[PDB]
């Protein structure tokens, strides 16, 4: 807090660093990415459209074809990458656009960061579209991402399929 | 205000107004409605004279664009509203580009302003000698031309009714009883600009 405010005054002026704004935004991103992980699980389940066995040739994608160890980049990774790039373009338009209908990514001119604190953020009495409940949901989503990453790394299974243990028959 | 003109006999000497319309807005809305009524009337009377010329096979003794090959003779061979579909493709452009020029001038270049705010509706007399290239009204008194304007409005309404009847009879057979069947009045019943679009 004040340690990071004194350590990085330029960075803590604009709300960056360990602040409540950063953690709320990261929780929202974790929620949408949980939805995206579930959607990609459905994508491998149904086989809506992308196939991940064919390759990306040089003659249609340039130097963004064969890149790692002279290894082909597949159409599934390319499709998910293109979707992520479009999400990032919408993200840049929202971050550097007019601040309408939205909490700002950064802090504006001389405004203090909010503080719904944390600890346990009482669920009863804060139901609905309240900042404390959305905050709790994003915090739980970030912890779910951390737990899924650790479980997949330990078990040696796919990140999309280590959650398939905890669903049972679901999507894929 | 609904004092204006067009209220006379055969309607009770009162405003014919079942639906609101006249009270849908204010004074400027009435001026716009009167300008629309007068312009609609004049267009209908002109269309009626042109349609009567077309039925009686009164065409110009010219050629109408020798490059295309269309002549005035086979523009009268076909029925009404199909002759407009055969006026090449530059002729529709020229008839049009002439008519917006008149519309833009008739609204813009008024020393008193638009008919909604200053100036009577149906008065493009600021276009010099446009209404009267000869004199015709040049010695007529004001009391005469007021009655003539009233006759203008009545004949315009009648011509609107008549051209609607002609379009309906050319479109839906048996709509007009006196028209019934006819040798002419055979065609699409409507004319799109530039033929198809």
């Amino acid at each position: 807090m004040s340690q990071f405010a004194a350590d990085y005054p330029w960075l803590a002026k604009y709300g960056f660093g360990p602040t409540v704004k950063a953690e709320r935004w990261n929780g929202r991103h974790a929620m949408f990415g949980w939805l995206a992980i579930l959607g990609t699980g459905v994508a491998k389940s149904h086989g809506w459209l992308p196939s991940g066995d064919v390759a990306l040739t040089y003659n249609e994608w340039g130097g963004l074809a064969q890149q790692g160890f002279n290894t082909y980049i597949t159409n599934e990774r390319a499709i998910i990458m293109i979707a992520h790039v479009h999400a990032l373009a919408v993200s840049a338009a929202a971050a550097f656009g007019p601040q309408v209908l939205g909490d700002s990514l950064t802090l504006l001119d001389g405004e203090k960061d909010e503080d719904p604190y944390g600890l346990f953020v009482p669920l009863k009495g804060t139901f609905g579209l309240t900042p404390a409940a959305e905050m709790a949901n994003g915090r739980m989503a970030m912890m779910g991402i951390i737990a899924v990453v650790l479980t997949s790394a330990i078990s040696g299974k796919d990140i999309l399929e280590v959650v398939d243990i905890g669903t049972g028959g679901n999507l894929l | 205000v609904e004092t204006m003109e067009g209220v006379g006999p055969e309607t009770g000497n009162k405003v014919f107004d079942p639906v609101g319309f006249a009270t849908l807005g204010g004074d400027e809305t009435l001026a716009f409605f009167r300008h629309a009524e007068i312009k609609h009337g004049r267009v209908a009377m002109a269309a009626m004279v042109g349609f009567l010329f077309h039925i009686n096979h009164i065409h110009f003794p010219g050629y109408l664009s020798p490059t295309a090959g269309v002549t005035f003779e086979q523009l009268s061979a076909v029925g009404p509203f199909e002759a407009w579909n055969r006026i090449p493709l530059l002729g529709q452009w020229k008839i049009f580009w002439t008519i917006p020029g008149l519309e833009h001038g008739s609204e813009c270049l008024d020393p008193a302003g638009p008919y909604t705010k200053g100036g009577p509706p149906g008065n493009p007399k600021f276009l010099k000698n446009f209404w009267d290239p000869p004199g015709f009204p040049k010695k007529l008194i004001e009391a005469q031309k007021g009655e003539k304007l009233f006759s203008n409005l009545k004949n315009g309404r009648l011509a609107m009714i008549g051209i609607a009847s002609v379009c309906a009879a050319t479109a839906v057979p048996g709509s007009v009883p006196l028209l019934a069947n006819a040798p002419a009045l055979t065609g699409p019943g409507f004319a799109l600009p530039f033929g198809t679009f």
Partner: protein, 158 residues
């Protein structure tokens, strides 16, 4: 009665989910009015095309409103896209100016009153008639498209 931001045309204080901040009220009204106007035009066009009105020509005939979108997209809907975007650009100017500052420009008031019908004594009734018709037409067009998507297109969509 949710907050004090309400109190305008078509207000019955209906906000159960509470999606109305002090800032997001003018944008909410502008979005509702834009959706309502586009839905009135959309429902009228869908019904009128399915009722029998056709563009004169062999291409635009034999087509219902459901299977019209993938036929005229590259040729006829492009002109509508150009004109709608042309109007929406100046609309964007006015809307953004209203959003940041400019203490006039009530949401929906684009100034498009050419006939000057607001000079009538029934102007507030025109306001609530517009809003009620916009809500009814959003519901009506959503109904029409979701019913016609489930097989039975016809005219009556049931």
């Amino acid at each position: 009665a949710p907050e004090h931001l309400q109190g305008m045309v078509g207000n019955v204080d209906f906000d159960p989910l509470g999606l109305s901040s002090p800032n997001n009220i003018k944008w909410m009204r502008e979005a509702e009015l834009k959706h309502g106007r586009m839905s009135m035009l959309a429902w009228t066009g869908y019904v009128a095309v399915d009722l029998g009105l056709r563009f004169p020509g062999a291409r635009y005939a034999e087509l219902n409103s459901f299977n019209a979108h993938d036929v005229v997209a590259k040729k006829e809907l492009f002109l509508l896209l150009l004109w709608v975007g042309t109007f929406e650009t100046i609309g964007a100017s006015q809307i953004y100016d209203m959003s940041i500052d400019q203490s006039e420009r009530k949401p929906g008031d684009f100034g498009f009153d050419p006939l000057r019908l607001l000079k009538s004594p029934e102007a507030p009734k025109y306001y609530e008639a517009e809003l009620v018709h916009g809500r009814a037409a959003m519901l009506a067009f959503s109904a029409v498209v979701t019913q016609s998507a489930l097989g039975n297109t016809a005219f009556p969509y049931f």
